[PDB]
Amino acid sequence: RKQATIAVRSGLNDDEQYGCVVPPIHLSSTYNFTGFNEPRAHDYSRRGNPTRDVVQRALAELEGGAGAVLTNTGMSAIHLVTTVFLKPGDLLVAPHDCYGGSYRLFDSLAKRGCYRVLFVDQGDEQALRAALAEKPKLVLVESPSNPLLRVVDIAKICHLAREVGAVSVVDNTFLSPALQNPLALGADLVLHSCTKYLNGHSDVVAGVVIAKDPDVVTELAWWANNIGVTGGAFDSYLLLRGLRTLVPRMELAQRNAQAIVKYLQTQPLVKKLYHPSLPENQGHEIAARQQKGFGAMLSFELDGDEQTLRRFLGGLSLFTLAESLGGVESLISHAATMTHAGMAPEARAAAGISETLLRISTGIEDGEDLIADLENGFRAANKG
Amino acid sequence: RKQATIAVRSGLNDDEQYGCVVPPIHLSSTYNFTGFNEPRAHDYSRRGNPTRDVVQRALAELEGGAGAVLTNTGMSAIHLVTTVFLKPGDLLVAPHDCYGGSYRLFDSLAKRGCYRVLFVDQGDEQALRAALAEKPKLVLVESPSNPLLRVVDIAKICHLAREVGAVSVVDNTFLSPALQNPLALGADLVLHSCTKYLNGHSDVVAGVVIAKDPDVVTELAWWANNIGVTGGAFDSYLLLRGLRTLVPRMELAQRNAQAIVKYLQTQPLVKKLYHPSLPENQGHEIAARQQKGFGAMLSFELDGDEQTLRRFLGGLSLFTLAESLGGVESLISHAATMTHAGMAPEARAAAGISETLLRISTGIEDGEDLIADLENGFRAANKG
Amino acid sequence: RKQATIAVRSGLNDDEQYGCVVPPIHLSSTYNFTGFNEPRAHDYSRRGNPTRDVVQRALAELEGGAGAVLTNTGMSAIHLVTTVFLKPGDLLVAPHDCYGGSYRLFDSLAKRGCYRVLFVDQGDEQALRAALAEKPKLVLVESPSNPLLRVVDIAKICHLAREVGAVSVVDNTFLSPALQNPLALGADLVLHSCTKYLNGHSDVVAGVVIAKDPDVVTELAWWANNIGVTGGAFDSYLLLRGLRTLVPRMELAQRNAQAIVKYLQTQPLVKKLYHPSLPENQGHEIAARQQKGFGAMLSFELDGDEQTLRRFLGGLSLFTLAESLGGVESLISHAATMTHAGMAPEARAAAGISETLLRISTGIEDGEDLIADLENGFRAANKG
Amino acid sequence: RKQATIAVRSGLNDDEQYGCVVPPIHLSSTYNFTGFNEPRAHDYSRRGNPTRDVVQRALAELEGGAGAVLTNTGMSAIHLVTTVFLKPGDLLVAPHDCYGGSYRLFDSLAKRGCYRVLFVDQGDEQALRAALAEKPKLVLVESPSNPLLRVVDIAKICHLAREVGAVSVVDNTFLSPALQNPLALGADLVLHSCTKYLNGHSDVVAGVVIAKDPDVVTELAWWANNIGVTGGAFDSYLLLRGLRTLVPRMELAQRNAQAIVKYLQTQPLVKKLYHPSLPENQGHEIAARQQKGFGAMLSFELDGDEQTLRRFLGGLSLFTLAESLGGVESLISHAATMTHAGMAPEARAAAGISETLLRISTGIEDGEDLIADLENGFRAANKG
Ligand SMILES: O=C(O)C(=O)CC(=O)C(=O)O
């Protein structure tokens, strides 16, 4: 069965007692024993919960993994994976342009001696080769990257990692299982911040780690319980509900993004445009090869200054100025003051992040309405 | 004024837009800015959420702390504290009889070199002083302990700790802020598995860390966001709801526990009985001095064999055989088979845990109803 | 089992598939067939829902009835009963001082010829008898009444109504099953606005109709499904959750009320006091006879003009000025502008409701704290 | 603002206090006054609720109405409209083939004399016009009809209805606002069971009545509060969440429906097919003219007997045998034993409802997978 079928039906008719099509929400923190010294499949929600189990199976199926571990946030899924595979003295190799939260977590802990971290431009074969020569225990890959949507060869990185015996984990948040499948590309693990596209409705905060090896699933589950990062039952339910429309949401959002990309290619005030589909985007060839779609995330550089930017923004009404991405509603953010405000000004410029770069998480509103709304912003930027 | 008033009214009327008496559930994962580079008090749920903020204030207030950080599980509240206060090379002194999850966590990470752990009998003055001489960075106290309900001097232990420069954190789950206040006894932090008494309804899994120092709150908050362990908004809602009846719940449950002890004090089949109110109970006098009540948890050894055990249990119907405690419903567990089945039989015995020891988490059903139920249990225990 | 045991254990361990102690929330609107022409116990939520079934069982049991039908509001439970036992031509006899929503509903449909309504002072036997001679098909009793708390003889009225062939229904909202059981006093049915005391947490809106006769239950169930007033599954879950602490909630709210009553008796600014516990209170002897407690609701007339009352309310802090009652938090209401705002001053006065009468819905905050707050209001009232 | 833009953004950023993008869930049953006699927009949740308001505005906007009243069920929305526009002596003209629940409701109350009802074949000019000449106060239209998908001329019926002073209401559940807009076709009111397509996730039960005249919205709102059929806050939240994806869901469901129709037209075992897009389908010219799409509901008569039907259903695995429709998951039902089981076979026969008619509520799974499943059922229908 195709991904559209899996997303819609996985977990349906789970209820064996009442014949409910949609599974109930098992909020119970505990479960009675069948008899003395005879517990059932679950004995304590923190360790195992029936509702979390259903969504874990659905997410594992969508990525083609053996099983999944749902965590309470995407950041705790990242913390779970690093906790399991790294101890003081061990080395982690991560992308030089990875998610700000991820960088901050690794940096903060490595600065305490908890483990070693090496940030590398994984697109640079020489740089990458040298990092892997240091024999890391874990290699994190994140593609496309934010906010320039730069793409790196997942299959190649995972292979080189496997060559030196490092476990590979791919943060597939930006494209979701509907537009990219890292396990099918050679990764040992794939994780997501379910807070984004998977839930798709901006009202659930959760993370997940999916593994190709069932023994690794069990190890992850063991550690998730041990440090207490398993996800809640209610969030599990809403996440599963959001998942039901994952495919049509991703296809329409992507279709909308392509329409916006095409329109922006004609705009004079668009100094630079970024999207995996653009032949000139860093790693486009790779994207065309390893992705099932180019994605709904995009970004562009407005020609002008801070007031031109404030003018542009002030002219919008269908894009909400806010953090995050992946929801059904269109959002816009200014990297220099939002996603990368925690990055040194010189660094941002050093990272190729312009002070006038705006990133758009395309929603599923009508594409022409969204484009007409951008037209209004551009009209406003050009007025003095 | 009084804690009963705090639990009931904290958070009420928070709504300034619609005038709702009960605050709404703020599930939104993100928040809009008022203008470019002008965020509001909240920018991302994982970092800060309006509903979680409210329940944190209620919990802080209930323990007399400056602030609280709600985590997704009690275990992650313990992991958060250890993560903030220990780094490779630092030492943690924990109770030799602390909660199983706490023990397993500290042990598993200490084995990896993340930090050092020394498990000590904090009731053994000589043993305690020696460990503190190791100059730990953190000292964890957990009283009463489970399942023998032994009690230790929190005020003293915290004083000693502070002297050696160690930060003290007390796991107050067993009694809740309604029956004991560690901060009042000189602790730097008090934490609870809100999954227990605080929520009181067995349908929420959450943890919380409350600090005396506001600077410590800010730091615990930064780290909780960093490693991703902040609790959910929905759980925050149901938790605060459960909190509204904490005082009446604890009062009635304690009364029923006291009534059950009495009845048990006539059972030729009760080989031994444990409760902090009994004069022969380890640490009873300290208990009478630092606690506000003796608690709703109790346990007793069944004079007989496994067969005698299965029989007694088989004759109950108002006590559910299950893990956990703190809920309005009465539960019973067999440590050897549940709580401590992870210990070798001799190890359990060494720890003073009998193969026929039964723990009761007293609920708020009718006392007489509860005693009567036990009556039938014993009747069967006898029967050939 | 006693009330407290019923309220706490109803529904526990219902989950036979995963053994959840707390029943899961069955939100599913549809159920599958076990095969062709093979329905299940449930087929359509609007008709039958597993979570609604549980709470209906609990409520029927708390009032000692055969069964219950949970409706979406207290008003629709009232509308359901009238729809079932009245058609054009039939007569309904109701209390002259019944709930304002009940009055408005009966009046509004009577005005359209849907049925005839007769409002009588059921405390007046000849009047009561005269009305019963008209041969009503249904008689509604509501005791105590709002806001004066007048009490009438439920057993007597139900007795008289039964001999003329009228079905009796009692609105037991004000006292709840914990303080009064109309089915035992002779009624055919008892209904409540679960929105108040039963839920007790001001975050659920629902109603319930409980019948002595099982046949009447299937009747009410058929009609509730027919006109679509069945309660929702999520509300059913939050209501059952609230039900868990009904007994200690009523007990404590009741004690705080008596203490407050006692206090007001010593207040000069208190012109009149109203509480079933007071000998002088209308129907006091009947209350002491038919009630298991005198209730948590009370009202008093302030000695002074409007500015005096504003002053009094303005000095308060532990009572929220709002409609509704039955929550854990203490609420205060000015009948002339709130509960009875819709009623000419001539009608209000005629009905015996002062322009300075205040109603208190006692919560479970600390009693001393509550009185200390009233003292603040009084001090301000007499403050010039 | 196109419908996709409205469905996705209506109500977004409603929270002015915290700036939440997604509106929080207002469960609060009561609201405080900003002072004595200074109530707020909301004073009692059963009357007005902030979360119900948001979804009401969204539903109203999608149908182009002035406002909407959300009820607890689709049946109570139907009961609310008939309650407002009919009283004893008044006449209701309803579709001869309307929804079973609707028929039962009107029949049951007309039999008690609550009002008069006339079931007419609205596709027959003679019968339709003779009924309108009876001067009804209300005319209910339901197109397409279940389970044959017959379509009637809404603009024509509403035109003739207005001529005789009747109010027109259209039950637009089957197509939803995304595929049909009765107000734009001249109706006074449009109602829906939100339990179906609007919510689309089978975990909400709700109804809604949308009116073109703001004065009628007020009247319907007054009555909804009066008889207590207003929908719940939690349901309002989940329904709004479901609305977010209405357009892509209907589009895809419809697209799949067309692919299934095309396929079934090739099955020798399909002796009769029904779908509005079919040239020979009763009312096709009207459908093509008044609908924005032909819809996702379809039906067909299996060539064979009851054992054949059994074999066919048994061969399916992606279609759940269950009542209801409109969810993201594909469902199938056998009218004779499910939807119209309570219709004497003679009646079903006179109604053109075959004993082997199967209705399909097309979901959003991959269309090829669904077709393959169907082929499997057919290959099994042949093994006999
Ligand atoms: O005026 C007539 O004869 C019509 O027949 C009008 C009509 O059908 C419509 O407005 O749909």
Side-chain angles (χ1 to χ4, degrees), chain A residues 1-37 39-384, chain B residues 1-37 39-384, chain C residues 1-37 39-384, chain D residues 1-37 39-384:
Chain A
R1 271 125 209 203
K2 284 107 155 306
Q3 59 176 11
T5 306
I6 296 152
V8 176
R9 316 194 57 93
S10 181
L12 282 198
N13 301 307
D14 181 75
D15 169 17
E16 272 152 67
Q17 196 175 337
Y18 295 112
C20 282
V21 176
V22 170
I25 314 176
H26 300 96
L27 297 179
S28 197
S29 58
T30 186
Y31 320 79
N32 66 64
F33 269 37
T34 250
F36 160 81
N37 198 32
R40 312 149 173 285
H42 311 86
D43 42 83
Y44 195 66
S45 185
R46 198 224 306 124
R47 190 198 105 255
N49 173 285
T51 300
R52 189 152 75 239
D53 281 351
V54 174
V55 76
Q56 275 172 173
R57 293 203 280 278
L59 294 157
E61 302 174 57
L62 257 9
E63 284 285 27
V69 173
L70 187 87
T71 67
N72 69 296
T73 63
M75 278 316 308
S76 76
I78 293 166
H79 182 57
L80 173 62
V81 176
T82 41
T83 288
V84 171
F85 298 98
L86 304 167
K87 51 224 247 295
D90 286 340
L91 172 78
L92 156 67
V93 161
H96 69 312
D97 62 1
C98 66
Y99 179 64
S102 301
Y103 182 99
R104 128 170 109 18
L105 170 66
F106 309 150
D107 177 70
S108 67
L109 291 189
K111 259 146 78 266
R112 291 163 70 86
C114 309
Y115 49 79
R116 287 148 57 224
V117 64
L118 230 202
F119 290 108
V120 191
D121 169 2
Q122 303 182 161
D124 177 345
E125 180 111 4
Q126 134 239 134
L128 173 60
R129 251 56 157 57
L132 300 179
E134 302 275 358
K135 280 316 220 82
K137 252 67 168 69
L138 182 72
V139 175
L140 167 72
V141 173
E142 182 183 337
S143 177
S145 75
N146 172 246
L148 302 192
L149 296 102
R150 187 268 194 117
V151 163
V152 294
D153 199 319
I154 294 166
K156 180 160 108 40
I157 302 171
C158 289
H159 175 68
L160 293 178
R162 187 165 275 105
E163 287 313 301
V164 307
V167 165
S168 57
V169 58
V170 186
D171 185 338
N172 194 216
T173 303
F174 259 44
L175 288 173
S176 93
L179 306 180
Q180 185 172 74
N181 300 123
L183 296 189
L185 297 172
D188 288 311
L189 310 169
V190 54
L191 63 75
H192 302 255
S193 153
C194 299
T195 314
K196 314 301 187 10
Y197 287 110
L198 287 168
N199 178 241
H201 297 72
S202 323
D203 59 359
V204 163
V205 179
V208 67
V209 181
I210 298 149
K212 128 192 76 109
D213 183 353
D215 290 341
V216 177
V217 169
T218 61
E219 178 81 1
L220 287 162
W222 189 91
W223 279 94
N225 175 58
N226 184 216
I227 65 174
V229 294
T230 45
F234 182 79
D235 277 290
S236 285
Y237 178 80
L238 273 195
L239 170 58
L240 178 64
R241 193 188 203 254
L243 273 192
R244 304 305 190 198
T245 55
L246 174 71
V247 185
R249 281 190 287 105
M250 295 312 294
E251 319 226 293
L252 175 55
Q254 173 171 261
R255 186 140 61 65
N256 276 351
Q258 292 293 347
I260 288 181
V261 161
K262 189 162 197 173
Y263 156 81
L264 289 173
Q265 293 189 100
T266 82
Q267 279 300 285
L269 282 193
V270 169
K271 176 168 42 167
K272 196 77 39 61
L273 176 65
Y274 306 95
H275 190 258
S277 74
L278 294 185
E280 86 256 21
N281 217 253
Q282 181 52 33
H284 166 83
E285 170 269 316
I286 290 149
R289 216 202 320 133
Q290 75 188 10
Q291 297 171 202
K292 298 191 286 179
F294 289 120
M297 295 295 307
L298 66 107
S299 54
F300 70 91
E301 281 175 22
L302 185 75
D303 208 357
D305 68 355
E306 190 193 280
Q307 299 294 315
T308 300
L309 194 131
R310 286 169 162 300
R311 272 207 301 293
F312 175 80
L313 290 172
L316 306 181
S317 47
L318 291 193
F319 290 86
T320 295
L321 185 65
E323 301 286 29
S324 213
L325 52 110
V328 286
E329 78 282 352
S330 282
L331 298 183
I332 191 171
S333 64
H334 179 231
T337 62
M338 297 175 58
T339 65
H340 292 61
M343 168 158 196
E346 345 89 34
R348 298 205 290 275
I353 284 55
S354 160
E355 292 296 295
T356 59
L357 180 83
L358 292 171
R359 181 197 67 182
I360 292 165
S361 167
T362 319
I364 56 167
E365 294 94 338
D366 177 81
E368 283 173 333
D369 282 355
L370 289 169
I371 283 163
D373 197 61
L374 286 175
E375 185 55 43
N376 296 157
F378 282 120
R379 268 167 193 143
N382 253 2
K383 267 193 230 147
Chain B
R1 287 57 99 62
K2 322 267 192 60
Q3 76 178 341
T5 293
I6 287 160
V8 172
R9 311 195 52 92
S10 203
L12 289 200
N13 299 308
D14 179 83
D15 180 18
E16 277 146 29
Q17 195 180 342
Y18 296 107
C20 283
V21 162
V22 177
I25 307 186
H26 294 85
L27 295 181
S28 195
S29 68
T30 182
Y31 322 76
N32 71 63
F33 279 34
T34 31
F36 160 93
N37 197 42
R40 307 172 178 253
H42 300 98
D43 59 310
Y44 195 70
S45 203
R46 189 232 302 125
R47 173 246 186 54
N49 174 281
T51 297
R52 186 160 74 236
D53 281 353
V54 171
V55 77
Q56 278 173 167
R57 286 190 286 265
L59 291 163
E61 232 200 296
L62 250 22
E63 287 276 25
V69 175
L70 186 89
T71 61
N72 69 296
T73 69
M75 275 322 299
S76 71
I78 290 147
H79 179 66
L80 169 69
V81 172
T82 36
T83 290
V84 172
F85 289 99
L86 307 166
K87 75 210 176 56
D90 293 341
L91 161 74
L92 158 73
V93 165
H96 67 305
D97 64 353
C98 66
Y99 177 65
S102 299
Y103 188 98
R104 169 184 51 180
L105 177 65
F106 304 156
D107 184 61
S108 67
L109 295 177
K111 281 163 124 141
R112 299 170 67 100
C114 303
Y115 47 73
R116 298 147 41 198
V117 66
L118 276 184
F119 291 100
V120 182
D121 177 339
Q122 321 202 138
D124 176 347
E125 173 60 306
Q126 80 219 24
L128 171 59
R129 242 68 136 81
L132 297 186
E134 294 312 81
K135 271 89 206 148
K137 288 318 176 126
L138 188 69
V139 181
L140 169 75
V141 179
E142 188 191 322
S143 168
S145 81
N146 216 282
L148 304 194
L149 293 77
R150 339 184 234 218
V151 169
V152 295
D153 202 316
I154 292 166
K156 159 152 78 228
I157 298 170
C158 284
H159 176 63
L160 295 186
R162 193 172 312 280
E163 282 182 341
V164 176
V167 161
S168 73
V169 51
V170 176
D171 187 346
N172 197 204
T173 297
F174 192 114
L175 291 169
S176 96
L179 302 187
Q180 183 180 72
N181 305 126
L183 285 190
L185 308 173
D188 289 308
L189 314 159
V190 54
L191 67 82
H192 304 253
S193 157
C194 298
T195 308
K196 282 24 175 301
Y197 287 112
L198 288 179
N199 175 236
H201 292 75
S202 323
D203 56 8
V204 160
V205 179
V208 66
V209 182
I210 298 140
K212 169 79 48 133
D213 185 356
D215 286 350
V216 175
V217 178
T218 295
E219 223 226 338
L220 287 156
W222 183 94
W223 277 94
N225 175 63
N226 188 220
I227 68 168
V229 295
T230 47
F234 182 82
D235 277 309
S236 291
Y237 180 77
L238 276 191
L239 170 46
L240 178 73
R241 194 198 204 240
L243 229 60
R244 303 305 195 198
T245 53
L246 177 74
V247 188
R249 278 190 290 105
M250 294 311 279
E251 175 281 341
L252 171 52
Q254 185 171 248
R255 193 136 47 67
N256 286 355
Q258 295 295 355
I260 288 178
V261 161
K262 286 208 172 200
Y263 163 75
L264 284 177
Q265 284 186 128
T266 76
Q267 256 337 275
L269 291 161
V270 170
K271 189 184 177 23
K272 180 82 236 259
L273 177 74
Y274 309 97
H275 189 265
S277 75
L278 304 181
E280 14 110 0
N281 218 257
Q282 250 131 323
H284 157 88
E285 114 82 12
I286 285 147
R289 179 170 21 96
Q290 78 187 4
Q291 307 190 184
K292 254 142 56 159
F294 296 107
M297 296 299 301
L298 60 101
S299 37
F300 70 87
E301 317 200 340
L302 180 78
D303 193 336
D305 87 297
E306 182 139 284
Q307 307 319 310
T308 309
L309 195 81
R310 313 200 134 135
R311 278 207 298 278
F312 166 79
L313 285 177
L316 297 178
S317 84
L318 279 205
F319 288 87
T320 300
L321 182 69
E323 318 265 16
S324 212
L325 54 100
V328 291
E329 76 284 353
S330 286
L331 305 170
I332 189 191
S333 46
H334 178 237
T337 277
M338 306 171 181
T339 319
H340 310 248
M343 249 155 144
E346 318 75 15
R348 286 200 293 273
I353 283 156
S354 166
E355 295 292 293
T356 66
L357 177 77
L358 293 169
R359 184 192 75 193
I360 284 168
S361 172
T362 319
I364 60 166
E365 299 93 327
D366 173 83
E368 298 199 5
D369 257 316
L370 295 176
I371 276 126
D373 189 44
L374 288 166
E375 252 297 328
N376 326 354
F378 283 123
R379 298 195 174 117
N382 281 301
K383 91 95 194 175
Chain C
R1 7 136 114 207
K2 333 277 144 12
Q3 224 150 43
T5 289
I6 289 157
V8 163
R9 306 216 124 232
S10 224
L12 289 207
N13 304 302
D14 176 76
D15 175 22
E16 285 136 1
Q17 195 192 340
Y18 294 108
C20 287
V21 166
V22 171
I25 309 172
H26 290 84
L27 296 178
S28 189
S29 59
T30 190
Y31 316 81
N32 47 97
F33 262 38
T34 332
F36 150 91
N37 195 7
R40 251 171 228 268
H42 299 77
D43 43 325
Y44 201 68
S45 228
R46 197 225 306 140
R47 210 217 56 172
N49 175 274
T51 303
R52 185 156 74 248
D53 277 4
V54 168
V55 81
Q56 290 180 154
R57 271 175 210 125
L59 296 162
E61 186 152 29
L62 286 173
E63 285 282 24
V69 169
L70 186 83
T71 62
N72 68 297
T73 61
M75 283 315 314
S76 66
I78 289 160
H79 177 62
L80 170 62
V81 177
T82 39
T83 293
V84 178
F85 299 99
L86 303 166
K87 72 200 193 178
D90 293 342
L91 167 69
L92 158 72
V93 162
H96 67 298
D97 61 357
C98 70
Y99 182 54
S102 300
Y103 193 98
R104 151 183 109 328
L105 171 68
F106 302 147
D107 175 66
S108 79
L109 292 176
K111 268 182 184 249
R112 299 162 68 88
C114 298
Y115 46 73
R116 304 136 57 201
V117 68
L118 233 180
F119 292 102
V120 198
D121 176 352
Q122 315 178 136
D124 184 326
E125 161 145 55
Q126 251 16 78
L128 174 56
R129 286 190 180 273
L132 291 191
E134 303 295 331
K135 295 305 227 114
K137 239 78 174 238
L138 174 81
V139 181
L140 166 80
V141 184
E142 181 181 331
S143 184
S145 73
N146 151 236
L148 300 181
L149 290 104
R150 289 199 198 95
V151 165
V152 302
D153 208 301
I154 298 173
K156 178 153 197 240
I157 296 160
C158 290
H159 163 58
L160 292 184
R162 192 163 315 262
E163 41 184 19
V164 291
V167 166
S168 53
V169 64
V170 185
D171 184 332
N172 198 204
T173 295
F174 257 46
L175 286 177
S176 93
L179 302 187
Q180 180 170 88
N181 305 118
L183 286 201
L185 289 158
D188 288 297
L189 320 144
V190 62
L191 66 79
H192 300 254
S193 153
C194 300
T195 307
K196 319 265 171 51
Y197 287 105
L198 286 173
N199 179 238
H201 298 78
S202 323
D203 59 356
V204 168
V205 177
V208 68
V209 181
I210 296 136
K212 144 186 308 172
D213 188 351
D215 298 325
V216 170
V217 172
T218 88
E219 182 81 337
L220 291 163
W222 184 95
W223 278 100
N225 174 69
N226 187 217
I227 62 172
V229 293
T230 47
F234 180 80
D235 276 280
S236 291
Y237 178 79
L238 280 191
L239 174 61
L240 180 79
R241 188 191 207 254
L243 268 188
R244 301 316 194 195
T245 56
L246 171 74
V247 182
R249 266 191 300 105
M250 294 310 289
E251 201 267 323
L252 170 55
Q254 182 164 254
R255 281 168 32 218
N256 278 343
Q258 297 289 0
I260 286 176
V261 162
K262 210 134 206 116
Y263 166 77
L264 293 169
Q265 275 175 141
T266 83
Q267 291 314 290
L269 286 165
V270 168
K271 230 32 198 103
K272 203 111 339 92
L273 190 49
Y274 300 95
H275 191 275
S277 85
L278 301 175
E280 342 77 67
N281 219 250
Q282 215 123 82
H284 165 91
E285 166 269 339
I286 316 166
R289 224 198 323 121
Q290 75 185 6
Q291 293 173 208
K292 302 192 295 203
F294 292 131
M297 301 289 318
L298 66 112
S299 56
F300 69 100
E301 303 175 14
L302 193 62
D303 198 349
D305 74 316
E306 187 189 357
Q307 223 248 287
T308 300
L309 179 124
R310 290 165 172 292
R311 247 184 271 123
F312 179 78
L313 292 175
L316 289 197
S317 268
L318 294 197
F319 296 82
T320 295
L321 184 74
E323 250 110 45
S324 230
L325 56 130
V328 291
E329 71 294 331
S330 288
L331 300 170
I332 187 130
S333 212
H334 179 234
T337 57
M338 293 165 64
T339 69
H340 292 69
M343 195 157 87
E346 284 87 4
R348 289 203 291 264
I353 288 132
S354 156
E355 284 307 295
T356 49
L357 171 83
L358 292 173
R359 193 196 56 191
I360 290 182
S361 175
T362 314
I364 60 174
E365 294 97 337
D366 174 74
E368 297 164 49
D369 284 346
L370 291 189
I371 292 178
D373 203 58
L374 292 174
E375 178 71 44
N376 240 62
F378 280 120
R379 295 242 195 94
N382 90 114
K383 245 258 95 95
Chain D
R1 206 142 109 124
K2 312 224 211 157
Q3 64 180 9
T5 302
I6 290 162
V8 177
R9 301 190 74 78
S10 180
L12 273 206
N13 305 295
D14 176 71
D15 167 40
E16 289 143 355
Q17 189 185 354
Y18 295 111
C20 289
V21 170
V22 170
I25 314 183
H26 292 91
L27 294 188
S28 195
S29 61
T30 189
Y31 314 72
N32 56 76
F33 282 30
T34 36
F36 172 74
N37 208 0
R40 308 159 140 303
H42 305 94
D43 15 75
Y44 201 71
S45 190
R46 201 245 283 116
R47 190 204 80 140
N49 175 281
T51 306
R52 188 162 70 246
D53 283 359
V54 178
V55 75
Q56 280 176 166
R57 288 189 282 266
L59 292 168
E61 230 210 327
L62 285 166
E63 286 286 23
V69 177
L70 187 84
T71 62
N72 68 294
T73 69
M75 277 318 306
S76 67
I78 289 167
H79 182 64
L80 170 68
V81 176
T82 46
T83 289
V84 180
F85 295 98
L86 308 167
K87 57 180 193 206
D90 289 344
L91 169 64
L92 161 72
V93 162
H96 78 302
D97 63 357
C98 61
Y99 176 63
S102 294
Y103 184 95
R104 177 188 70 218
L105 178 59
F106 309 148
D107 190 49
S108 81
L109 290 178
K111 274 162 154 82
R112 292 162 73 85
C114 300
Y115 45 79
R116 306 146 46 211
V117 66
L118 230 153
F119 291 103
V120 188
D121 172 354
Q122 309 189 155
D124 181 82
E125 304 273 1
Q126 188 281 334
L128 170 68
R129 299 173 187 251
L132 293 186
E134 279 310 317
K135 298 206 255 131
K137 295 294 173 174
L138 189 61
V139 179
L140 165 68
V141 178
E142 184 186 321
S143 180
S145 81
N146 173 43
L148 296 201
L149 284 58
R150 311 228 239 95
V151 172
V152 296
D153 198 323
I154 297 162
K156 186 183 74 201
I157 296 160
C158 292
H159 169 93
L160 295 167
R162 191 160 283 106
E163 266 188 346
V164 299
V167 163
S168 59
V169 53
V170 177
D171 182 339
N172 189 213
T173 301
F174 256 41
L175 286 174
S176 94
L179 301 180
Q180 187 172 72
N181 301 122
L183 294 187
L185 298 166
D188 284 300
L189 303 155
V190 57
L191 67 75
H192 300 255
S193 157
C194 295
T195 308
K196 318 282 173 37
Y197 290 110
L198 288 172
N199 176 242
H201 295 68
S202 309
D203 58 352
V204 164
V205 174
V208 71
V209 183
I210 298 150
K212 81 157 179 69
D213 184 352
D215 281 349
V216 175
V217 176
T218 302
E219 210 202 346
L220 288 157
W222 186 90
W223 279 93
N225 171 72
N226 185 217
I227 68 165
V229 299
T230 51
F234 182 81
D235 279 293
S236 287
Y237 179 77
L238 275 193
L239 169 62
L240 182 63
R241 193 196 205 244
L243 268 193
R244 300 318 192 193
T245 59
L246 178 69
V247 185
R249 286 191 281 105
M250 299 306 293
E251 184 280 350
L252 182 46
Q254 185 170 248
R255 188 139 55 74
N256 279 342
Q258 299 292 358
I260 289 176
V261 171
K262 204 134 106 211
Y263 162 74
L264 291 168
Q265 268 169 140
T266 87
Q267 277 320 290
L269 275 136
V270 170
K271 95 234 295 225
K272 203 82 91 82
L273 188 63
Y274 302 87
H275 188 255
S277 75
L278 288 176
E280 45 289 337
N281 218 256
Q282 176 155 345
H284 170 74
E285 184 278 324
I286 298 164
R289 158 160 60 88
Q290 80 189 3
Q291 300 172 197
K292 303 193 287 191
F294 289 117
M297 295 302 304
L298 67 114
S299 69
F300 68 97
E301 299 169 17
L302 184 65
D303 187 353
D305 59 358
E306 203 252 57
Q307 271 316 335
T308 303
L309 180 101
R310 243 153 204 228
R311 294 203 294 285
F312 178 81
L313 292 172
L316 309 176
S317 72
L318 291 188
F319 290 88
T320 288
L321 173 64
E323 236 145 336
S324 205
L325 53 112
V328 289
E329 78 278 355
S330 283
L331 301 183
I332 185 154
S333 87
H334 174 234
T337 63
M338 274 150 247
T339 58
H340 296 68
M343 225 184 112
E346 299 78 38
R348 293 202 300 265
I353 299 180
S354 166
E355 286 308 287
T356 52
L357 184 72
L358 295 167
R359 183 191 70 195
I360 280 176
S361 166
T362 313
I364 57 151
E365 298 92 338
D366 178 87
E368 283 159 54
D369 282 340
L370 291 180
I371 277 27
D373 202 54
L374 284 178
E375 181 62 60
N376 177 28
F378 281 119
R379 117 186 344 134
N382 284 130
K383 176 189 300 217

